[PDB]
């Protein structure tokens, strides 16, 4: 409805109305029901509400679900263990990967799948079980790539965010030599002017909201290695 002048608060407090009070009243206090409309109001949320928006934090159900109950009286009350395994469950899991630059930055490798909506995307994927952060980006580059960006990973260097509810961060590597050698069905550099939304494009949906952030880094690194300080 509408479009997006909402300030955060007003949305949660129209996502308790239209999920929550709204229920039939004979279910008001059901838990199966209650997780259900809280789960459908995190996607309507991640998928509807900031696609009109944009400066809406993505959030993943354990964050939103707290900000919702601390906004719905009814959903306060309404049995704490199994509210807890919904949220341990339900997690959307964390993606640690790399975005790796050719020198100039000017390019960036790119992977693509053999599944049929195809698509191209930085090397990345979920966390394991007692696994660092650091250890996940190493893991899914070498597993898609083939190459061991163990020597030149940095942990401060990085673009972190939520998209649909699920925390992905991507370690940004520079100085990949061009002639590096390179399941997965193709791995390739491509020319991040050329990429969508930098300066058919449905190919690059999986990288496009790194682009900014991205971008944003390279114009620092440029600045940075060609300064004095003074």
């Known amino acids: 409805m509408s479009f997006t002048n909402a300030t955060f608060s007003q949305v949660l407090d129209d996502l308790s109305a239209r999920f929550i009070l709204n229920l039939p009243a004979e279910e008001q206090s059901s838990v199966e ?33 707290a900000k919702l109950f601390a906004h719905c009286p009814l959903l306060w009350k309404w049995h ?22 050719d020198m100039s930055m000017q390019q960036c490798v790119l992977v693509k799948g053999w599944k049929a909506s195809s698509g191209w995307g930085f090397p990345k994927g979920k966390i394991d079980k007692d696994e660092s952060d650091v250890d996940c980006a190493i893991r899914e580059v070498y597993e898609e790539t083939g190459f061991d960006c163990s020597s030149r990973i940095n942990p401060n260097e990085f673009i972190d965010m939520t998209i ?16 590096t050698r390179f399941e997965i069905s193709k791995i390739e550099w491509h020319n991040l002017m ?10 690059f949906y999986m990288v496009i909201p790194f682009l900014a952030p991205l971008k944003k880094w390279i114009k620092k690194r440029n600045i940075a290695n060609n300064t004095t300080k003074e």
């Open 164 to 179: 649909r509810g699920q925390n992905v961060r991507l370690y940004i590597i520079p100085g990949i030599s061009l002639d």
């Open 194 to 203: 050329d990429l969508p939304t930098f300066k058919m494009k449905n190919k």
């Open 80 to 101: 704490e263990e199994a509210f807890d395994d919904f949220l341990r469950y339900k997690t959307r899991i964390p993606v640690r990967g790399a975005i790796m630059l």
């Open 33 to 65: 029901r209650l997780c259900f409309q809280i789960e459908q109001a995190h996607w309507f949320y991640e998928d509807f509400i900031r696609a009109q928006n944009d400066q809406l934090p993505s959030l993943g159900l354990r964050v939103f679900s």
